[PDB]
Structure 1
Amino acid sequence: MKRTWQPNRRKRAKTHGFRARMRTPGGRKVLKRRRQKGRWRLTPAVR
């Protein structure tokens, strides 16, 4: 039956992408937490 992950690159980038963090003051702090941890990928990797 139909499971939860049904993938889409349009959905993934427009929701989780870099420019969609930097609208909101919350998601600007997400990248701040992820610079500071040392993340190799700040945003989820989409083609």
Structure 2
Amino acid sequence: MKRTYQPNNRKRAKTHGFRARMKTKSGRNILARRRAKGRHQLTVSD
């Protein structure tokens, strides 16, 4: 059926992961956004 979910450790991870977000302006942005703003955890945390 091929949905769109097949997760890929390697993938998903990579792609998304503390770092990256960081590395980025943007990413970083929202991130520290989320942080306070909300609490929670985060991607990679995932």
Task: Looking at secondary structure, tell me which structure has more helix per residue.
Answer: 1
Q: Which structure 1 segments of 5+ residues have no match?
A: none
- Do the aligned partners of 1:21 and 1:30 also contact (CA within 8 Å) in 2? no
Show the counterpart of 2:23: 23
Residue aligning to 2:14: 14
Counterpart residue number, 1:36: 36
TM-score by length of 2: 0.75
Count residues in correspondence.
45
* Alignment partners' CA distance in 2, 1:17 and 1:39: 17
CA displacement at 1:20 relative to structure 2: 0.9
